[PDB]
Amino acid sequence: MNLEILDLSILGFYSLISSNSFESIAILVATIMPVITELWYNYSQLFALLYTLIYVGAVVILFVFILSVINEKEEYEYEYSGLFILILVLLLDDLDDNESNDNDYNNVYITDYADWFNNYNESDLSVIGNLLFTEYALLLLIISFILLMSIIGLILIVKKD
Amino acid sequence: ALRRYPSGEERCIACKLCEAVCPAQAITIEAEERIDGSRRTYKYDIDMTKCIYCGY
Amino acid sequence: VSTFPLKSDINITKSGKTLLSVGQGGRSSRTGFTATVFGGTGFLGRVVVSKLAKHGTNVVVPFRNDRARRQLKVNGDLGVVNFVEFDIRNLKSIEDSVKYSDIVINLIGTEHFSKNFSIEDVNIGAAERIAKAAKEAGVSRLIHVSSYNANPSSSSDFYATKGIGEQVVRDNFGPDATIVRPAPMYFRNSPFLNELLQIKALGGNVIFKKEVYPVHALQVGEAIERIAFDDATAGQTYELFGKERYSKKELREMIKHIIHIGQRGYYPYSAGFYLPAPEPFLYAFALIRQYISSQPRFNVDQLKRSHINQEIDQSAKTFTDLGMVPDELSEYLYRYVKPHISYTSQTQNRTVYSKEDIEKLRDYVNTP
Amino acid sequence: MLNNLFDFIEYIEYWLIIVAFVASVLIVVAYLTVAERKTMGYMQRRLGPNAVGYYGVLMAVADALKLLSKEIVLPHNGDIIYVMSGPLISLFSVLLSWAVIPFGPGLSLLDSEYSIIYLLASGSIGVFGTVIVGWMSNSKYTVLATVRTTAQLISYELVLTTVVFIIALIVSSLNINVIIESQYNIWYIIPFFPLCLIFFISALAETARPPFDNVEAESELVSGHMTELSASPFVIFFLSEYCSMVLMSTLTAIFFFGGYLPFSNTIHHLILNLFDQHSIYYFIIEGILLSGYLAIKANFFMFSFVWIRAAAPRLRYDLLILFCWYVLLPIVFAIVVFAPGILYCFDALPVII
Amino acid sequence: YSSDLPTDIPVLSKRPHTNLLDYTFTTFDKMKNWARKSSFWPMTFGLACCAVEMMHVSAPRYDQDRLGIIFRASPRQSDIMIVAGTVTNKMAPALRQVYDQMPYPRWVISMGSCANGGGYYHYSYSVVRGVDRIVPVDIYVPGCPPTSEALMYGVFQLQKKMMDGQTHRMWYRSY
Amino acid sequence: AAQTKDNNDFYDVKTKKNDFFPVQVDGIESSLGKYEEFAKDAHEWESWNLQNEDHPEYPVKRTKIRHFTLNFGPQHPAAHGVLRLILELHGEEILRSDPHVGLLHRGTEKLIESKTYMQALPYFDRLDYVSMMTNEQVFSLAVEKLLNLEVPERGQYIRTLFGEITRVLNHLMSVLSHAMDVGALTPFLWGFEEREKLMEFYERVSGARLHSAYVRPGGVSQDLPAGLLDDIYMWATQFGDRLDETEELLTDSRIWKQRTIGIGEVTAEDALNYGLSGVMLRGSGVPFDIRKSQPYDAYDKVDFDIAVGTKGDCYDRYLIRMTEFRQSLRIIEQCCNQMPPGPVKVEDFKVAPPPRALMKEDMEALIHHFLLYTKGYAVPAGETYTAIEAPKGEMAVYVVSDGSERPYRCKIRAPGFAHLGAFDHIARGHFLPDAVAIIGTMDLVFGEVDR
Numbered sequence A: 001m002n003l004e005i006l007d008l009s010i011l012g013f014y015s016l017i018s019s020n021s022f023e024s025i026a027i028l029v030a031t032i033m034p035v036i037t038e039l040w041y042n043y044s045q046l047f048a049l050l051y052t053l054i055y056v057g058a059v060v061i062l063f064v065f066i067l068s069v070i071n072e073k074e075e076y077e078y079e080y081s082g083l084f085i086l087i088l089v090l091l092l093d094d095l096d097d098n099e100s101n102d103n104d105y106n107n108v109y110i111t112d113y114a115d116w117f118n119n120y121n122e123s124d125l126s127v128i129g130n131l132l133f134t135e136y137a138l139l140l141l142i143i144s145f146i147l148l149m150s151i152i153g154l155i156l157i158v159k160k161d
Numbered sequence B: 001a002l003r004r005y006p007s008g009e010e011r012c013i014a015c016k017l018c019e020a021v022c023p024a025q026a027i028t029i030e031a032e033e034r035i036d037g038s039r040r041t042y043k044y045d046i047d048m049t050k051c052i053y054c055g056y
Numbered sequence C: 001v002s003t004f005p006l007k008s009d010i011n012i013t014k015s016g017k018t019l020l021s022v023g024q025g026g027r028s029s030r031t032g033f034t035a036t037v038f039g040g041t042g043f044l045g046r047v048v049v050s051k052l053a054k055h056g057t058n059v060v061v062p063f064r065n066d067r068a069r070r071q072l073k074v075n076g077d078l079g080v081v082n083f084v085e086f087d088i089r090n091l092k093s094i095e096d097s098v099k100y101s102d103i104v105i106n107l108i109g110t111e112h113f114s115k116n117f118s119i120e121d122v123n124i125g126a127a128e129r130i131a132k133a134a135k136e137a138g139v140s141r142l143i144h145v146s147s148y149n150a151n152p153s154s155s156s157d158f159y160a161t162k163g164i165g166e167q168v169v170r171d172n173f174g175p176d177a178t179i180v181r182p183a184p185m186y187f188r189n190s191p192f193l194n195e196l197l198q199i200k201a202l203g204g205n206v207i208f209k210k211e212v213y214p215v216h217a218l219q220v221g222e223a224i225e226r227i228a229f230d231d232a233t234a235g236q237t238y239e240l241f242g243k244e245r246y247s248k249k250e251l252r253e254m255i256k257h258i259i260h261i262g263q264r265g266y267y268p269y270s271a272g273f274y275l276p277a278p279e280p281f282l283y284a285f286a287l288i289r290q291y292i293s294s295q296p297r298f299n300v301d302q303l304k305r306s307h308i309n310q311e312i313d314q315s316a317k318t319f320t321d322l323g324m325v326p327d328e329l330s331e332y333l334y335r336y337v338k339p340h341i342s343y344t345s346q347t348q349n350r351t352v353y354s355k356e357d358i359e360k361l362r363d364y365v366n367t368p
Numbered sequence D: 001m002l003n004n005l006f007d008f009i010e011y012i013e014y015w016l017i018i019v020a021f022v023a024s025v026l027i028v029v030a031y032l033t034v035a036e037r038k039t040m041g042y043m044q045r046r047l048g049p050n051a052v053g054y055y056g057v058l059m060a061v062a063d064a065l066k067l068l069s070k071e072i073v074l075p076h077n078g079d080i081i082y083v084m085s086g087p088l089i090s091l092f093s094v095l096l097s098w099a100v101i102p103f104g105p106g107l108s109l110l111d112s113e114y115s116i117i118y119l120l121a122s123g124s125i126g127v128f129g130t131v132i133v134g135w136m137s138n139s140k141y142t143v144l145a146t147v148r149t150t151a152q153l154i155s156y157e158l159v160l161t162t163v164v165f166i167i168a169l170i171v172s173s174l175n176i177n178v179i180i181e182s183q184y185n186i187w188y189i190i191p192f193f194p195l196c197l198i199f200f201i202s203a204l205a206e207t208a209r210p211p212f213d214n215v216e217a218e219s220e221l222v223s224g225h226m227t228e229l230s231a232s233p234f235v236i237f238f239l240s241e242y243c244s245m246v247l248m249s250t251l252t253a254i255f256f257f258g259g260y261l262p263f264s265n266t267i268h269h270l271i272l273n274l275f276d277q278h279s280i281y282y283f284i285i286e287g288i289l290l291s292g293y294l295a296i297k298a299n300f301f302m303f304s305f306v307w308i309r310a311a312a313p314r315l316r317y318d319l320l321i322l323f324c325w326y327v328l329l330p331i332v333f334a335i336v337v338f339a340p341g342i343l344y345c346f347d348a349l350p351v352i353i
Numbered sequence E: 001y002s003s004d005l006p007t008d009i010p011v012l013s014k015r016p017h018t019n020l021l022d023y024t025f026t027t028f029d030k031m032k033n034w035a036r037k038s039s040f041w042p043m044t045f046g047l048a049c050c051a052v053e054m055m056h057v058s059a060p061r062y063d064q065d066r067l068g069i070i071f072r073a074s075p076r077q078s079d080i081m082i083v084a085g086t087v088t089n090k091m092a093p094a095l096r097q098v099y100d101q102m103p104y105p106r107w108v109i110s111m112g113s114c115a116n117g118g119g120y121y122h123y124s125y126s127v128v129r130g131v132d133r134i135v136p137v138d139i140y141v142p143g144c145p146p147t148s149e150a151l152m153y154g155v156f157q158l159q160k161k162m163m164d165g166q167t168h169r170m171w172y173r174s175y
Numbered sequence F: 001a002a003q004t005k006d007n008n009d010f011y012d013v014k015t016k017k018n019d020f021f022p023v024q025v026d027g028i029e030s031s032l033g034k035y036e037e038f039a040k041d042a043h044e045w046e047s048w049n050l051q052n053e054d055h056p057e058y059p060v061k062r063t064k065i066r067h068f069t070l071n072f073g074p075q076h077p078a079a080h081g082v083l084r085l086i087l088e089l090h091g092e093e094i095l096r097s098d099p100h101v102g103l104l105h106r107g108t109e110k111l112i113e114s115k116t117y118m119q120a121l122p123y124f125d126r127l128d129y130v131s132m133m134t135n136e137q138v139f140s141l142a143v144e145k146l147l148n149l150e151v152p153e154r155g156q157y158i159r160t161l162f163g164e165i166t167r168v169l170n171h172l173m174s175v176l177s178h179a180m181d182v183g184a185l186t187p188f189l190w191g192f193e194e195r196e197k198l199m200e201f202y203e204r205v206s207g208a209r210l211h212s213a214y215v216r217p218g219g220v221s222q223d224l225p226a227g228l229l230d231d232i233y234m235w236a237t238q239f240g241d242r243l244d245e246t247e248e249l250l251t252d253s254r255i256w257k258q259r260t261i262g263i264g265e266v267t268a269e270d271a272l273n274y275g276l277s278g279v280m281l282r283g284s285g286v287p288f289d290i291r292k293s294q295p296y297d298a299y300d301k302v303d304f305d306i307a308v309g310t311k312g313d314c315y316d317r318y319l320i321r322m323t324e325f326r327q328s329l330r331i332i333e334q335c336c337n338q339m340p341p342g343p344v345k346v347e348d349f350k351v352a353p354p355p356r357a358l359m360k361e362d363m364e365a366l367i368h369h370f371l372l373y374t375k376g377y378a379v380p381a382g383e384t385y386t387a388i389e390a391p392k393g394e395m396a397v398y399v400v401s402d403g404s405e406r407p408y409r410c411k412i413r414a415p416g417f418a419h420l421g422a423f424d425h426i427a428r429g430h431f432l433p434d435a436v437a438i439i440g441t442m443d444l445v446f447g448e449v450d451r
């Protein structure tokens, strides 16, 4: 039983019924956690950890803004929905989870063959840094330039002075 | 605590000095003449929840 | 309540004592009476003991729970409230409670049974023992509180034992024993309203169809005060009920709107507000929890009583015989379900349901 | 039985290893609460808890059992999601961070080339779980404390992350075990004495410990985010906060004092030469020895957590923000440029081996 | 619907242990009573000069912390309420609200003549004549102010009563 | 002030002054017709709005939202007892402070009129209940002044000796509790053991650790027990180290100075206008002390110095209160070395009780003992305003005598009452943690404030 399917089923239910802004900042965290875990267990543990290191800091800053802008509006308001229309919507959605229509690509299993030629064996992050700091160093230096612009941009927007 | 003489007789002569001094009015005294004829009290109450433990 | 609960400052008990009253009726006053309230730590005892102790009537409260009795001492002045550790299986402790009292009030009664006490032990065995112990101690007035549908020949083990208990109280204490038959009582932390205010009520489609005539608990506590201080009420049976008849389905649905659980079209159905179940499942689950759960849950006998509606005994006396007007649940329903309203807290504007608004809501509930 | 009984232990052996791992960490956390009051007591010329259990050894047990026997305060029985989700996120975060702590060579539940990132990433989740208590709450002291938690997180997160990255840069690895074994000939306290202070200062701010206890400031916000918490939700938050103190004390011993490496190589060999290596008793003693070295170093920093609480007054959090952004960040980013330049000048760029 | 009730079964506080379950729930009670007595967390509620003596109990000479006594700011973390000072009419509703917010089990200690019965200010227009008009009180400590040892003795009396609790054997033998 | 059209209780319509020209636009048209031809349907066309929200005079009805209002109520460690400090915050910045008091108002002034002068004395023990003996002294001085009596020489020195022991007892409570509220827990524990040693001297002379009705009109209730001065002198030989160790954790600490430097600044003008006295006045540069201005009870026969601040903030007053620690110890040593022999109470049995040995042999002593405890002593009609240098500041009593044995009126001037009345002026601008520092630097005991 792939229990990640159940997790996304609950998350989709709570995204349809979410009312206030605090629930939305919880839908975000309830989305990154399935992403981080599935990356950890299937494809990339490096990027599972990079997601946690960067998105959490963004989440708390996002949460602190909710405190300064919460404006009483959706606590006392009413929503109608209907339990039957919610579950029927989620049932129809769950029916079609085939993002791709290449049946052979989705059904036939493949393998790779290992070789011993790579005797200098290092992590993916060392190769990523090796290329990023040598061949795509321009991409890194532009990213540094964009980060500098954000620093100036945030000040010229928020600072009253 | 009320005190006795060594003979066992009470020291208090029901003179009601301590009742008048008591800043908190925590002392209540009723007195009369004893059967043997002595000036003795039959009622001496201190309200310990009203006393301020002041020694007067 | 009032300021002085007596018609005079002198009262001669039917046992021969003459009791004078002192003071204007405050905490420092006295009425000259000593009363014993069995079951004073219960829901109704706290109402009764508070009304007796506030006017200076010395109250003996026999307890089995040491923590539950502590709040009772605050009701009266120094020396007014007295506690006796007791058990209905202990006879010396029962006599000690009534040894000095001129009035004995019996509020002991359960709708359940446990490993130690059956419904026959409490609703009959205790009531009989207390009535006899009261008589040997020279108590002038006995007041026994049965249920609203007391009947010695009832199909319900609670209604039957309550009905038999009425008989045994008169057979021991004598014809002068007074009997009270309250309806379901509503108040703060009321057992009647608590099951209606609970969210995950299983099998409400069966349980909540019973119709009743609910009565304010403050009036029942006030009526008992009238009965004890008026000897013309000896040997009488009182049916204390409200003027209006409600079914628990109506109140359950009326409460839902006051709690505003219906603000969402999905939330009540998702949260378990409605939990329909076949009656055999309700029987098995009630039967199973009777030997597995340690806390008194909805038992088998309460399932049977869900079908039996409240029948007012027409030969008994009412609030009007005591010179009192019954309160209306419409004028008190909001303030007693007010603690359970979800957001409230001066968010934008409170919806204070007046007496007129509650009756308007009742029609809307009954509209399909 | 016999054979089935014997190989069932083999089927359950690693679960007991984890249970023993969990038990070992909880014993330190439980008795850190006792040790803090004893240490503060004698510094304050009192005794501290000595009446609950023989010489006070059951004080931690009594505090947990009493709090676990208390009523939980919440508007409704179904409102557990409100004041329990926060404590659980905080507790699960710090406990998962212990998966990468090696008590000896290879004795960590999780070993990977990115153990450093996992350590920082896991602890960042605990910060999120703290702010959840002020979830549109009507308690103004809980709300006021949530604002201060975010302000402190911004202060220490950059400095603490960058300091650990400099240590990882000196060894060119993000594996915690490799960093410990890289300190055989030198403990990083000597080359990076400024960074050890900054790491400990960041640890005090991360754990909301004085002089950075602006979150749970009793004299300011009665109990901070805990003012509405009672019974089990209060224990879990209290347990997780003291778990974080043990974790950051152990990380101070790992990043700068060689982790489990012996204080004296001569004495370490002398003690281990008494036991035959062909017997299982050698590896018990070695496990006790290596963890003892880690325990001694971590005990000193757990002592230092208590020591700074009993000597320094509290600093306002708005001053903490200026201190971290105007003082600590410029210094740490200077060393992140200083250190590679020194190593390149002497042809000593690190590699993993 | 007949019944037959025993007559000579003793009360809970005097009932001896007869079977195994009597020992089992007594052990269950003792452990919980031991913890609550050991973790004695009063609420910081010093009102007047009676608070000075309560602060001296935490002072190094007496050091209540050695007995497991820790003062908590929030009522949620407290199980003992020590009323140390005069309770005025302006303060009584706040005192009752603070008491009501303590999760059970909760005990109240009344310290000093003001809290016991009014004391020096008994005949004042703005003083409550005893804190037991507002909240239940478990023990009364006398003095103006009670000494630190007098307060510690009062705490020791409460801990003695807490160690006699039989809550779980009450369920077994009285319910 | 007055409900107007653009400003009322529930909302306001705020318009700023127009910086730009009042440009006139007439004849609005599109390419299909004039404005009035489509103005009926222009409500659905956002591009047809003639009112611009950036204009300074754009009408906006804004509900008046309560600012973040916090009850810094009685149940709070910062408040030294029962203080319902109501703060309107902007985040954590204080915008307005409303100290609500009377939670410890017990009608002491009303009750005193019903008591004789001797019976009313213990009421003063319970106003500033850490500086107990100083409170008794100001009432005793006022009654002695009305009685036209004076304490003998040894009695005056005893009131000076325990006047400075009491001052140390107060500053240990004040300085260390203020430090503890800032976050320095340890100094509180060290110095409270010094309070235990000092309260031992309190208990030996009177029999009460705290409420020692020992200073009475005419002198002191009982003489010093044998061996008391040696214990006091022995305590004094070590107390210098206790003060130094406390200063090791606070005085030069950068964290302590960051919490106190520039916090709660008070100008010398505002200190006088708001009636601040003692350390609050002296921290602002004013060198004024009541022990110097109107000397009393052997303060003229000892030597001490007054510390005066220059910046009038919390750090200046901390240094001043630490100097007074050492100046009191200087006075304590002098009193121990200069205590004269002789009677401790006035030699008048119409005011002071006679000795018990004389009471039980002399008829005139027994009459005076009987009359003193059943009627008190009459005080000549008049009034007085007597002030002392209490550890909190200027404490004074305004007593009115009607010629009887009961005081007609007794108004107690509490130094903390005036200090708390300037809190809103002082704490504005500062943050919520700074209010904790400002409260602790005023030395607020609310029994004194409310009485």
Ligand SMILES: CCCCCCCCCCCCCCCCCC(=O)OC[C@H](COP(=O)(O)OCCN)OC(=O)CCCCCCCCCCCCCCCCC
Residues within 6 Å of the ligand: A007, A008, A010, A011, A014, A015, A018, A019, A022, A023, A024, A026, A027, A029, A030, A031, A033, C264, C267, D081, D082, D085, D086, D088, D089, D132, D135
């Ligand atoms: C350690 C476990 C922590 C979580 C345990 C509590 C379980 C509750 C749900 C957790 C996340 C599941 C998906 C929910 C996404 C957010 C949607 C939301 O609004 O929260 C649901 C919660 C329930 O409120 P409810 O009364 O049912 O609905 C409103 C009725 N008008 O409304 C609330 O606002 C309460 C939310 C409390 C704070 C939760 C913060 C998010 C934590 C997520 C961590 C785990 C990541 C998600 C894993 C599951 C994925 C489905």
Ligand SMILES: NC(=O)C1=CN([C@@H]2O[C@H](COP(=O)(O)OP(=O)(O)OC[C@H]3O[C@@H](n4cnc5c(N)ncnc54)[C@H](OP(=O)(O)O)[C@@H]3O)[C@@H](O)[C@H]2O)C=CC1
Residues within 6 Å of the ligand: C038, C039, C040, C041, C042, C043, C044, C045, C063, C064, C065, C068, C087, C088, C107, C108, C109, C110, C111, C117, C122, C145, C146, C147, C148, C182, C183, C184, C185, C186, C191, C192
């Ligand atoms: N809606 C209602 O509440 C109705 C009430 N009644 C009857 O009114 C009376 C008052 O009950 P109420 O206050 O409302 O709610 P409770 O259930 O709390 O009444 C039970 C009271 O009697 C005591 N009791 C029960 N069994 C025993 C026992 N073996 N030994 C000693 N005491 C026992 C209980 O003591 P303890 O508190 O220590 O557990 C409690 O005080 C009851 O007899 C009830 O049958 C009838 C119709 C309506």
Ligand SMILES: CCCCCCCCCCCC(=O)OC[C@H](COP(=O)(O)OCC[N+](C)(C)C)OC(=O)CCCCCCCCCCC
Residues within 6 Å of the ligand: D193, D194, D195, D197, D198, D200, D201, D211, D304, D308, D312, D315, D319, D323, D327, D331, F254, F255, F258
């Ligand atoms: C290059 C080598 C780097 C050295 C590495 C260490 C860096 C430390 C920087 C400190 C600077 C500082 O204390 O800053 C002070 C700042 C702001 O002070 P300010 O407002 O500017 O006033 C001071 C400016 N004066 C004096 C010039 C006017 O806040 C503080 O009080 C921070 C107090 C931190 C105490 C934390 C306790 C840690 C205990 C550790 C036990 C193991």
Ligand SMILES: CCCCCCCCCCCC(=O)OC[C@H](COP(=O)(O)OCC[N+](C)(C)C)OC(=O)CCCCCCCCCCC
Residues within 6 Å of the ligand: D061, E030, E031, E034, E163, E164
């Ligand atoms: C499993 C979950 C975690 C473990 C939790 C442990 C908590 C600690 C237990 C509470 C301690 C407690 O109760 O000991 C304190 C109690 C309190 O005695 P008292 O009330 O003053 O009356 C007792 C004195 N009389 C009756 C004379 C007045 O001493 C006892 O009676 C202890 C006596 C029984 C000792 C039996 C020991 C058997 C061996 C046990 C070890 C193998």
Ligand code: SF4
Residues within 6 Å of the ligand: B011, B012, B013, B014, B015, B016, B017, B018, B019, B029
């Ligand atoms: S009445 Fe009071 S003062 Fe007079 S003798 Fe008796 S105890 Fe002493």
Ligand code: SF4
Residues within 6 Å of the ligand: B018, B021, B022, B023, B024, B025, B026, B027, B046, B050, B051, B052, B053, B054, B055, B056
């Ligand atoms: S010590 Fe107590 S009883 Fe005696 S006079 Fe003083 S207040 Fe009254």
Ligand code: SF4
Residues within 6 Å of the ligand: B052, E048, E049, E050, E051, E084, E085, E086, E111, E112, E113, E114, E115, E119, E120, E143, E144, E145, E146, F126
């Ligand atoms: S009882 Fe005495 S010491 Fe206690 S608060 Fe009242 S006056 Fe002060």
